[PDB]
Ligand binder design. Structure first.
Ligand SMILES: C[S@@+](CC[C@H](N)C(=O)[O-])C[C@H]1O[C@@H](n2cnc3c(N)ncnc32)[C@H](O)[C@@H]1O
Ligand SMILES: C[S@@+](CC[C@H](N)C(=O)[O-])C[C@H]1O[C@@H](n2cnc3c(N)ncnc32)[C@H](O)[C@@H]1O
Lengths: 393, 392
């Protein structure tokens, strides 16, 4: 209500005078209560106007980034508009009008009528960092594709995009006959910025803590030879390291990391003690799975990137290598019907590259098509992220 | 302050509990909540809200384009499978797009397989001003916003003040045209534009702030003198509103002037009332062909152009005025820095060479035009005013 929102502002205001640090959960509770009050108070005209304002605040921020203006505003204190325009080489009038939009939305602050200053909301834009990179990637790489969607579906029909080719991203870029990865290989700077961002937001999903891997330990003791955990597309090998430190009875010596040759070379050179002690193979999981009869094959946050047929083909390669008692673990979102907002928004983005978040029923369909049977689903506490346990059917 | 904002919410909550609340009170409550948002949001909240806004916008645009909102009933619900069959599309992608709006509170899902409107999506289920206003921003401005960086790299970091080579014309690919001309050349974009001019009365009221009844007397001094010339009047909504408030002003004595393509469209879209006015194609950059009218009204025109172009537009009208003629500017008037809603539009308007102005900025322009301001009548519900002028 309006009253509980005021109560949380009073608590915040108090904790700030006392120098106590707000907690993350406290911050979300306050943002949540605000959104509930706005939902209750805003009329449709208010929602639509706020949506339009979001467009121009984003465009203002994009233009000031392009002009390198956030770098020139000091961390603290104020800079004169005239001084800012001189350092940019631009007309003070248009630079002032753009800042005025951000002043009226509380992104910037004016200290007189001629000086402007940062807030906590704009300091991330004043230098290189993962959040700025993520912001720019989503704006430059995603918003144009969002605008092209009606045109895209006019062209291909109102159909779920499921291929790796003729994606909406590639269609927007003008090369529908290339994959997104081939497009990005033609674009070093955009790929560089994407690494910084794609790496940061991976750490928002948990690797362990909601699924017990320790049942692998008995087999590690009955047999000296059987490979234990094969991580398919596991990147730097951090998942395997965590699993084996959570359960030291699982020798990382007997686990396998599979990725692309360029990523396996980085694991060997500047990788740490134990990941380097594990078998590292450069593979293409679209076409092959060399390790035969391992106890566990793991596919974490990968199937979301592909359509059903591509997932079934990936799964069928793994099933061909599985022994009768092998498990195939899929770590991914099992979205609800209907889905919560974060997975719903990820699913929307994924439609630009041919992927999707899948419901439980959709996961049963693709696993059944691969000759698998889901025996369990173990949920994390984070946005329906689960461990899906499968066996040969 | 957080503590002063809390006090605002507490007193507005008391007001609601005691019962109605006026438009000003709504606006003020929304305004306070936006102050709360500013005071409370951190970068990751700003990022999330940015992404959500673009994704929701895109999902709305697709469902509009596919005619989905029109097929969801005003009340009740409809199965995804019925929706899909009726639009001739794949049930899975349509479900996925609706699910996004279900998750963000725009649509509601019933059971496992049915979808329903909320008050947030009924505006998109048919033709109305609010929807037209939203479509104007999304179809006619958002792609242009994405062109601003390249545009300023093409022409320099300078305020865009010309009526040609606007960011909009730059994006449109028509360097030889004004924005008004670009709009006037496609029937659907023109029809949407006209309908949007009825929207956002809370910002751009058509009546309630200026009294026209002084005209009714003079209406008797002549059977043919034009009473109100509506310069760039779109489809005459403001003329119809004025002539309802003051029934002594006959609409037949008023002139609706706009671009050739716009005024022709008024012939098919307008009702018998406005079609009984004097419709007239003009180009107000070059001319005011009706000399000696009683009132020249310039409503939400100057906002669309830079200072020099405004002065030049005004000078053509001054030339046409009789000594007893009045020139009326109806438009937004904000402070500095601009308020929330005018600040949004000032940024939008830079793509077409215009801007939001203070009262002082308008006085400078009317002065350069050879006009004297005899009065400024502000609305008590919106930063909007009628500036009454005569020849100096
Ligand atoms: C979404 S990323 C990260 C997935 C990882 N399991 C995790 O927990 O984050 C998917 C990984 O798959 C790898 N990959 C992409 N294509 C591959 C292929 N054809 N064969 C093997 N690995 C591939 C990439 O190098 C990337 O590290
Ligand atoms: C912001 S709209 C205002 C419409 C209407 N006066 C109102 O306030 O609702 C600007 C109007 O000016 C018209 N316009 C633009 N350039 C024009 C020109 N050169 N000559 C005549 N009308 C023009 C547009 O077609 C549009 O109808």
């Amino acid at each position: 209500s309006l009253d509980t929102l005021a109560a949380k502002l009073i608590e915040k205001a108090k904790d700030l005078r006392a120098g106590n640090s707000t907690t993350p959960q406290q911050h979300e509770a306050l943002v949540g209560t605000l959104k509930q009050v706005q939902d209750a108070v805003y009329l449709p005209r208010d929602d639509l106007a706020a949506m339009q304002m979001g467009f121009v605040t984003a465009a203002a921020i994009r233009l000031l980034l392009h002009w390198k203006v956030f770098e020139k505003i000091p961390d603290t204190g104020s800079i004169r508009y005239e001084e800012l325009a001189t350092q940019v080489g631009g007309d003070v009038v248009i630079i002032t009008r753009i800042c005025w939009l951000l002043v009226a939305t509380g992104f910037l602050v004016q200290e007189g009528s001629d000086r402007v200053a940062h807030t906590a909301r704009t300091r991330p834009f004043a230098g290189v960092n993962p959040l700025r990179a993520w912001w720019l990637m989503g704006y430059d790489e995603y918003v144009p594709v969002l605008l092209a969607m009606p045109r895209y579906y006019d062209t291909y029909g109102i159909k779920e995009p499921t291929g790796r080719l003729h994606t909406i991203k590639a269609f927007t870029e003008g090369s529908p006959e290339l994959t997104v990865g081939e497009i990005m290989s033609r674009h070093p700077e955009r790929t560089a910025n994407m690494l910084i961002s794609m790496s940061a937001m991976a750490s928002q999903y948990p690797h362990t803590g909601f699924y017990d891997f320790s049942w692998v330990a008995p087999k590690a003791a009955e047999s000296a030879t059987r490979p234990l955990i094969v991580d398919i597309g596991g990147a730097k090998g951090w998942t395997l390291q965590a699993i084996c430190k959570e359960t030291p009875e699982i020798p990382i010596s007997r686990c396998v990391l599979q990725d692309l040759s360029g990523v396996i070379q980085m694991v060997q050179t500047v990788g740490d003690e134990d990941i380097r002690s594990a078998q590292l193979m450069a593979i293409d999981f679209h076409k092959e799975q060399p390790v035969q009869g391992a106890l566990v094959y793991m596919i974490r946050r990968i199937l979301r990137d592909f359509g059903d047929d591509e997932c079934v083909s990936i799964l069928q390669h793994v099933v061909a290598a599985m022994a009768p008692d092998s498990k195939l673990l899929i770590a991914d979102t099992v979205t609800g019907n209907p889905p919560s907002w974060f997975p719903a928004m990820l699913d929307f983005f994924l439609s630009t590259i041919g992927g999707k978040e899948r419901t439980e029923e959709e996961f049963r369909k693709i696993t059944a098509r691969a000759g698998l049977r889901i025996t369990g689903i173990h949920y994390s506490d984070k946005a329906e992220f689960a461990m899906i346990v499968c066996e040969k059917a």
